[PDB]
């Protein structure tokens, strides 16, 4: 029923070219094909018809015998191609020794499933899916083109080079699109790429299907502006027509594939919508001798091609009245002046088709040479050409292609190849073209970023979220695509440990600038400078001057009656304690070290205790003599209890060594202090307070007595005031942080009031 192109020969080679368009979604069941094709149709048919005659004319290839062909139309449809393939193998049920496989991957799979049953090798020129690399299922299938694994790698490289992270995905329903999108999704989601949503659609889908697909694509338009299309040319054209219908004229960047390549028939009429698209095209130089033969073809003389008259009518819209094919649908006639030179575009994969035919010829040549080296022709051992031997010879053959490079097949039947990255641009006014803006070879992507985006303002990068590495802010993911995150700044206490978590530093520590890491907060100590410490040391200096003056005035007047009243040694240890207190004041405000830290503690424990014990063991005799031991050796009765005092601090000392803790009152600052604790400091103060209570009780006992210049009342008043000076600082000491300056002040004031109200009257009048 369907027509076929013949060429007589001793050996017949089949061919499946999509001369006509895929049947519409209505007429699929009738299996009637659409309009004729030029690039994928007549050009390839003429290419095969001419290359066979070139081979036949060549004496150095397939000598003494001729190569024929039986070219059939597959209409880019699996059913039509399967029917034509059945027509191929009808003889096996002149035999077809091999076919030049169809262009579509799914169609090639369908044809191979039938052909491998009859041992008919099949060489494809544009079938690209990875599924055809499985030699277990597709043993009799070979390619002159690489698989789409390299194409998926190239697409991922392109999306990676341009910061594209949040893209959408579209692929044509079938085997090429499906496998390509699976490979792309795998190797993209592996590295860094996030897909907004993957869509699939048939090439022959209606207008409504493409409209719905474009609406779904636009649902993510503000964020995902890049659409990775592992789609055929017709799918991309349908997308462009949908864009035109609903007024989208540059909101998307279409990233095409080998299906789009640099085809002018997929952007014609809709150039404005496809501008800025980036496509991948298998590298194949133009074939000059094909152009020299094709452009001189005329319908009157071209009889061996059954589709040439229809193509001539369809291209130059006209009617060939003289010939049986007229097609009066075209109103005007064709004058003998129209030529194929005008608006001639040679298809991209012409080299591949010629290479496939040459490959089959060379395989046949090798097999013939191997079988009968002597005979020049078809030997008796070659009349029943075996498909297995031909396949074996083809799998190892190597030759020189039309381009000039070496064509050879690997273990999977594929062939080496490199890609060109083309960009659809507007060059002039009302002029669009495909510009070669890069290449991809074995993982090396050499792109040129000046022709595409001839400026710094490129396409808005398809990113879900802006880079959120701005200082404090971290990144959290809400379960959806790991590229759509939300930004939360975390507390100044913590610093970022990774991009998704920030952790806290140690108890005493602060994050560094920009929270890159963590540092140690400097320990700010009580300095020898500062207002309060310098005031304290001034106080201590005044105190020392007072003590030395009083000691001098006592040494001058040793045995005077106005002095020799009580034990003189008690009124030596009192001044000793007074001096030691101010020595403690000096020792306290200092860098916390090992020696100073126990020196200050033993001093605080020992000084006021000694002085006030001396005062008590003076007043005891002083008032018991008038109320009704003593002698002069009361110094002992003091010392022993003072020794007890010493002993108890020994008990407190042995438990707590004079170390330094690093007090942390807040997260911001760090302080260092002595090893003094509540238990270690409340006991000596408790003992001192008991002594104070006894002294106060007994100063009350004596109060007013007639003595030498009335010491008793003044010392009682000093005791009274000291009792409350001690208590004043208690709230701002127990639990506070400045307990050192308070200790210095308390000791200073206590010493001053004790010295000023017991010594000053007596020695003052003595000097006066």
Ligand X SMILES: N[C@@H](Cn1oc(=O)[nH]c1=O)C(=O)O
Ligand Y SMILES: *[C@@H]1O[C@H](CO)[C@@H](O)[C@H](O)[C@H]1NC(C)=O
The residue assigned the tokens 């992270």 is 165
Check binding of 501 to a copy of itself (CB under 8 A).
Answer: yes
Query: Shortest approach of a copy of itself to residue 305 CB, angstroms?
Result: 26
Smallest distance, ligand Y to C-beta of residue 513, A: 22
How far apart, in whole angstroms, are the C-alpha atoms of residue 757 and residue 723? 14
Residue 128 counted as an annotated binding residue: yes
- Decide: 485 and 468 in contact? Cβ < 8 Å: yes
Cβ neighbours of residue 186 under 8 Å, at least 6 residues apart?
none
Which residue from 99, 155, 754, 763 is in contact with ligand XQT, where contact means CB under 6 A?
Answer: 754
604 binds ligand XQT (CB under 6 A): yes
The residues that bridge with 660 in the sheet, in sequence order, are: 674
**Which residues in 403-462 contact ligand X (CB under 6 A)?**
none
- For residue 737, the partner it binds in a copy of itself, ligand XQT, ligand X, none, with Cβ less than 5 to 8 A by kind, is none
Map the footprint of ligand Y across residues 428-467, applying CB under 6 A. Answer: 449
List the beta bridge partners of residue 195. Answer: 167
Choose from a copy of itself, ligand XQT, ligand X, none: what does 736 bind? Cβ within 5-8 Å by kind: a copy of itself
Beta bridge pairs of residue 194:
166
Q: Minimum distance between the CB of residue 157 and ligand Y, rounded to whole angstroms?
A: 11
- Taking only Cα atoms into account, the Rg of the chain, rounded to an integer number of angstroms, comes to 53
Residue 128 in the binding site for ligand X (CB under 6 A): yes
Write down the least CB distance from residue 496 to ligand XQT, Å.
45
Task: Rule CB under 8 A: say whether 90 interacts with a copy of itself.
Answer: yes
Helix and strand numbers (H, E) in the chain are 20, 24
φ and ψ at residue 167, rounded to 5 degrees: -110, 165
Window 175-204: residues binding ligand X (CB under 6 A): 176
Asked whether residue 176 is marked as a ligand-binding residue, the answer is: yes
607 binds, among a copy of itself, ligand XQT, ligand X, none (CB under 5 to 8 A by kind): ligand XQT
Which residues are CB-contacts of 229 (< 8 A; sequence separation ≥ 6)? 170, 171, 235, 236, 239, 254, 255, 256, 257, 259, 260
Count other Cβ atoms within 10 Å, centred on residue 738. Answer: 13
Residues in the chain whose C lies over 2.5 Å from the next residue's N (breaks after): 93, 628
The residue within the footprint of a copy of itself, chosen from 136, 331, 516, 678 (CB under 8 A), is 136
As a whole number of angstroms, the distance between CA 286 and CA 513 comes to: 60
Residues between 76 and 95 that touch ligand X (CB under 6 A):
none
Please say whether the beta carbons of 19 and 75 come within 8 A. Answer: yes
Question: Which residue's CB is nearer to a copy of itself, number 502 or number 589?
Answer: 502
Question: Is residue 585 annotated as involved in ligand binding?
Answer: no
Q: How far apart are CA 394 and CA 387, in angstroms?
A: 10
Tell me which stretch binds a copy of itself (CB under 8 A): 110-118, 373-381, 630-638, 685-693. 110-118
Say if CB 464 and CB 165 are below 8 A apart. Answer: yes
**CB 729, CB 745: distance < 8 Å:** yes
Quick one: how far is CA 463 from the chain centroid? 12
**Among 10, 53, 83, 265, contact with a copy of itself (rule: CB under 8 A):** 83
Closer residue to ligand XQT in complex, CB, 144/602: 602
Rounded Cα distance between 97 and 88, Å, is: 10
C-beta of residue 89 within 8 angstroms of C-beta of residue 35 = no
Quick one: which segment of 375-383, 419-427, 516-524, 722-730 binds a copy of itself (CB under 8 A)? 722-730
**Residue 163 binds which entry of ligand X, ligand Y, ligand XQT, none, with Cβ cut-offs from 5 to 8 Å by kind?**
ligand Y
Q: CA triplet 45, 230, 351: central angle to 5 degrees?
A: 30
**CA 532, CA 528: separation in Å to the nearest integer?**
10
Residue 55's closest CA among 97, 96, 102, 13? 13
Least gap, CB of 105 to ligand X (angstroms)? 4
268 φ/ψ sector (left φ>0, alpha ψ -120 to 50, else beta): beta
Annotate each residue in 150-179 with x if it binds ligand Y (CB under 6 A) or - if it does not, as one string.
-----------xxx----------------
How far, rounded to the nearest angstrom, does the alpha carbon of residue 646 sit from its chain's CA centroid?
A: 68
Report if residue 532 touches a copy of itself, rule: CB under 8 A: no
Binding segment toward ligand X, per CB under 6 A, in 126-134, 446-454, 530-538, 634-642:
126-134
Q: Please give the residue ranges that form the binding site for ligand Y (CB under 6 A).
A: 161-163, 449
Which residue numbers belong to the known binding site?
A: 40, 105, 126-128, 176, 258, 349
Q: Please give the residue ranges that form the binding site for ligand XQT (CB under 6 A).
A: 577-578, 580-581, 604, 607-608, 610-611, 685, 726, 729-730, 733, 742-743, 746-747, 750-751, 754
Q: Please give the residue ranges that form the binding site for a copy of itself (CB under 8 A).
A: 25, 28-29, 78-79, 82-83, 86, 90, 93, 110, 113-114, 116-117, 136, 139, 476-479, 482, 488, 500-501, 721, 724, 727-732, 735-736, 742
Q: Please give the residue ranges that form the binding site for ligand X (CB under 6 A).
A: 103-105, 126-129, 176, 232-233, 258-259, 349
Which residue numbers belong to the known binding site for L-glutamate?
A: 40, 105, 126-128, 176, 258, 349
């Amino acid at each position: 029923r369907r027509v076929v192109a013949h060429m007589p020969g001793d050996i017949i080679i089949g061919a499946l070219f999509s001369v006509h368009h895929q049947p519409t979604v209505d007429k699929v069941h009738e299996r009637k094909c659409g309009a004729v094709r030029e690039q994928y149709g007549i050009q390839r048919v003429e290419a095969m018809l001419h290359t066979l005659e070139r081979i036949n004319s060549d004496p150095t290839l397939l000598p003494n015998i001729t190569l024929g062909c039986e070219i059939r139309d597959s209409c880019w449809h699996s059913a039509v191609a399967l029917e034509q393939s059945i027509e191929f193998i009808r003889d096996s049920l002149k035999p077809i020794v091999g076919v030049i496989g169809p262009g579509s991957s799914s169609v090639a799979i369908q044809v191979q499933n039938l052909l491998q049953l009859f041992n008919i090798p099949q060489i494809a020129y544009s079938a690209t899916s990875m599924d055809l690399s499985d030699k277990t299922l597709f043993k009799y299938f070979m390619r002159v083109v690489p698989s789409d694994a390299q194409q998926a790698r190239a697409m991922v490289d392109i999306v990676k080079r341009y910061n594209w992270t949040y893209v959408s995905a579209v692929h044509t329903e079938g085997n090429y699109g499906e496998s390509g999108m699976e490979a792309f999704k795998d190797m993209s989601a592996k590295e860094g790429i996030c897909i907004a949503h993957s869509y699939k659609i048939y090439s022959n889908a209606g207008e409504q299907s493409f409209d719905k697909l474009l609406k779904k694509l636009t649902s993510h338009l503000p964020k995902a502006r890049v659409v990775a299309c592992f789609c055929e040319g017709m799918t991309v054209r349908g997308l462009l027509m949908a864009m035109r219908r609903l007024g989208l004229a540059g909101e998307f960047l279409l990233l095409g594939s080998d299906g789009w390549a640099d085809r002018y028939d997929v952007t014609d009429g809709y150039q404005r919508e496809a501008v800025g698209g980036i496509t991948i095209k298998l590298q194949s130089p133009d074939v000059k001798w094909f152009d020299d033969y094709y452009l001189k073809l005329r319908p009157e003389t071209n009889l061996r091609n059954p589709w040439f008259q229809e193509f001539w009518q369809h291209r130059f819209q006209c009617r060939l009245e003289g010939f049986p094919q007229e097609n009066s649908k075209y109103n005007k006639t064709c004058n003998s002046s129209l030529t194929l030179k005008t608006h001639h575009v040679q298809d991209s994969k012409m080299g591949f088709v010629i290479n496939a035919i040459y490959s089959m010829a060379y395989g046949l040549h090798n097999m013939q040479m191997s079988l009968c080296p002597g005979y020049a022709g078809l030997c008796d051992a070659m009349k029943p050409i075996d498909g297995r031997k031909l396949l074996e010879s083809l799998m190892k053959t190597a030759f020189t292609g039309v381009s000039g490079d070496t064509i050879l097949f690997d273990e999977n039947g594929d062939s080496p190849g490199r890609y060109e990255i083309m960009n659809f641009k507007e060059m002039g006014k009302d002029y669009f073209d495909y510009i070669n803006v890069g290449s991809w070879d074995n993982g090396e992507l050499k792109m040129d970023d000046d022709e595409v985006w001839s400026k710094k303002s490129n396409i808005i990068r398809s990113v879900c979220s802006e880079p959120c590495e701005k200082g404090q802010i971290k990144v959290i993911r809400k379960g959806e695509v790991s590229c759509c995150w939300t930004c939360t700044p975390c507390k100044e206490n913590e610093y970022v440990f990774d991009e998704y978590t920030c952790k806290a530093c140690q108890l005493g520590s602060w994050p560094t600038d920009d929270l890159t890491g963590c540092d140690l907060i400097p320990v700010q100590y009580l300095r020898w400078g500062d207002p309060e410490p310098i005031a304290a040391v001034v106080f201590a200096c005044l105190g020392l001057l007072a003590t030395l003056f009083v000691t001098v005035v006592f040494i001058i007047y040793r045995d005077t009656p106005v002095v020799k009243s009580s034990s003189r040694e008690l009124c030596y240890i009192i001044l000793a304690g007074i001096c030691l207190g101010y020595l403690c004041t000096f020792c306290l405000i200092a860098k916390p070290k090992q020696i100073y830290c126990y020196l200050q503690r033993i001093g605080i424990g020992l000084s006021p205790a000694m002085s006030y014990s001396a005062l008590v063991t003076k007043t005891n005799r002083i008032a018991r003599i008038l109320a009704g031991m003593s002698a002069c050796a009361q110094l002992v009765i003091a010392f022993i209890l003072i020794c007890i005092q010493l002993g108890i601090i020994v008990a407190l000392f042995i438990m707590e060594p004079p170390d330094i803790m690093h007090d942390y009152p807040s997260i911001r600052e760090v302080y260092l202090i002595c090893n003094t604790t509540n238990l270690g400091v409340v006991a000596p103060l408790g003992y001192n307070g008991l002594l104070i209570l006894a002294c106060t009780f007994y100063a009350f006992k004596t109060r007013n007595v007639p003595a030498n210049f009335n010491e008793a009342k003044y010392i009682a008043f000093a005791m009274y005031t000291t009792c409350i000076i001690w208590l004043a600082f208690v709230p701002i000491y127990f639990g506070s942080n400045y307990k050192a300056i308070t200790m210095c002040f308390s000791v200073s004031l206590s010493a001053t009031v004790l010295l000023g109200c017991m010594f000053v009257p007596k020695v003052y009048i003595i000097l006066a």
